[PDB]
Ligand binder design. Structure first.
Ligand SMILES: Nc1nc2c(ncn2[C@@H]2O[C@H](COP(=O)(O)OP(=O)(O)O)[C@@H](O)[C@H]2O)c(=O)[nH]1
Length: 290
């Protein structure tokens, strides 16, 4: 868990920019469930045109077709997007491959100038909980000061044939300013922190599922709900079917909310991408010119 406050943010920006000076390529790690909303709002100013591999992690918990629309988006920005499952170790060899492609022009011009070939230096950057330390551990094939009061120095990890990876990720803050992004981040568990009401997060999640995977929602909770019912009827049908009740047969809404949030966060109902590309056209247009 990370506590953001202005000074911590300024320190994070400073330190990540500094680390970025030591590398050839940056791996921006995002959640495949929200490839756009799980980005740091200042990521392009921090990265500052450094060759970029965008890694869509937790692909196992998302929708591939939707992810492909985001990959196309990143491609159009001049980045090299790849999707992985860092936890279950699926598709990792493509990280090095992507790095080689992203830095190919730099190293071609070095070879033209008569410089010796050399290992690619990379670092991973992203918001909390997108899977940075998981990915680093997996790429090192080992868990990455162990005496109290002894300070860890940053080190390079040999990865594959061509890649040196900084063993310490740059950690940046999530988008804060927008309430729908707040809900998306809470639904993926990127922020398990207050000042976004859980009941509203649960409502958002349920509505997402009603619109995009209604049969699955119903079969998962084994419920059937009138299509003209308001969202409260969904909380009630779930609560009643699961016996989440209190004070006779009133619905324990806190418990229903927690169950819905848990099931969406842990992909118990399905594998969804909550950044719907075609619904985010205006947001993308606003963010773009910068
Ligand atoms: N299902 C799944 N879980 C993942 C993946 N990468 C990380 N996780 C899990 O997501 C949580 C956050 O991972 P973590 O590496 O600590 O994120 P970090 O804050 O960016 O270093 C952990 O519980 C991981 O086990 C993935 O690719 N698939």
């Amino acid at each position: 868990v990370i506590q953001w406050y202005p000074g911590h943010m300024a320190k994070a920006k400073r330190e990540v920019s500094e680390q970025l000076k030591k590398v050839d390529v940056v791996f921006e790690l995002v959640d495949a469930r929200i490839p756009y909303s799980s980005r740091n709002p200042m990521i392009d100013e921090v990265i500052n045109q450094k060759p970029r591999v965008v890694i869509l992690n937790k692909k196992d918990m998302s929708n591939l077709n939707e992810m492909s629309k985001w990959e196309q988006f990143f491609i159009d920005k001049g980045y090299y997007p790849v999707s992985v499952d860092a936890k279950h170790g699926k598709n990792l060899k493509k990280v090095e491959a992507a790095a080689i492609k992203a830095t190919a022009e730099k190293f071609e011009r070095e070879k033209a100038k008569g410089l010796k070939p050399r290992a690619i230096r990379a670092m991973i950057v992203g918001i909390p909980n997108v899977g940075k330390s998981t990915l680093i551990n997996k790429l090192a094939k080992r868990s990455i000061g162990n005496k109290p009061g002894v300070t860890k120095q940053q080190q390079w990890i040999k990865v594959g044939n061509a890649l040196q990876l900084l063993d310490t990720p740059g950690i940046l803050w999530p988008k804060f300013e927008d309430e729908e992004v707040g809900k998306k981040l809470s639904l993926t568990g990127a922020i398990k922190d207050s000042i976004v009401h859980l009941d509203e997060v649960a409502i958002y999640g349920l509505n997402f599922l009603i619109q995009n995977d209604l049969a699955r929602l119903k079969s998962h909770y084994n419920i059937e709900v009138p299509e003209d019912a308001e969202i409260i009827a969904w909380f009630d049908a779930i609560g009643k079917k699961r016996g989440l009740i209190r004070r006779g047969n009133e619905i324990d809404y806190e418990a229903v909310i927690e169950l819905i949030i848990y099931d969406i966060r842990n992909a118990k109902i399905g594998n969804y991408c909550f950044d719907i590309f075609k619904d985010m056209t205006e947001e993308l247009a606003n963010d773009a010119n910068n």
